[PDB]
Amino acid sequence: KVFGRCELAAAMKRHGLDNYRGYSLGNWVCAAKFESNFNTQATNRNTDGSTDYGILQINSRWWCNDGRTPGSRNLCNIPCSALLSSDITASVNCAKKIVSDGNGMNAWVAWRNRCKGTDVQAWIRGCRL
Ligand SMILES: O=N[O-]
Numbered sequence: 001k002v003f004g005r006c007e008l009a010a011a012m013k014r015h016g017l018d019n020y021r022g023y024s025l026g027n028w029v030c031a032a033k034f035e036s037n038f039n040t041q042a043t044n045r046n047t048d049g050s051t052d053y054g055i056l057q058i059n060s061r062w063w064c065n066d067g068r069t070p071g072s073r074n075l076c077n078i079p080c081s082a083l084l085s086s087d088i089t090a091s092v093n094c095a096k097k098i099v100s101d102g103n104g105m106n107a108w109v110a111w112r113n114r115c116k117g118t119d120v121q122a123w124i125r126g127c128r129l
Pocket of ligand 1: 064066069072074
């Protein structure tokens with residue numbers, strides 16, 4: 001499913017991401033835009049053999065099992081295909097564990113390079129929240 005900007009913002013708020021670990025809703029919307037273009041079916045292979053999955057591009061090196069990343073971890077205890085659902089519950093719950101892991105949102109390269117230090121509030125502008 002390809003989410004609209006305000007539709008995603010509302011689902012993320014519903015799921016409790018707004019100000020989670022001090023990151024405002026705009027940060028998560030900005031990250032999702034640049035990681036997956038709001039597409040739940042997004043997948044990208046990494047140079048090391050692992051793969052990023054879903055709207056928040058969660059990677060199989062640590063977080064999920066995709067049956068093809070030998071010697072990796074499954075810290076969110078899920079198949080990576082669960083991250084590709086039209087329902088973002090599994091992605092949001094895994095994102096909460098990632099952001100709590102010590103490095104905050106710097107875990108997302110696209111956030112660090114494209115969202116961090118910018119006016120992220122612009123991403124929830126005009127939305128009925
Ligand atoms: O993602 N472990 O194959």
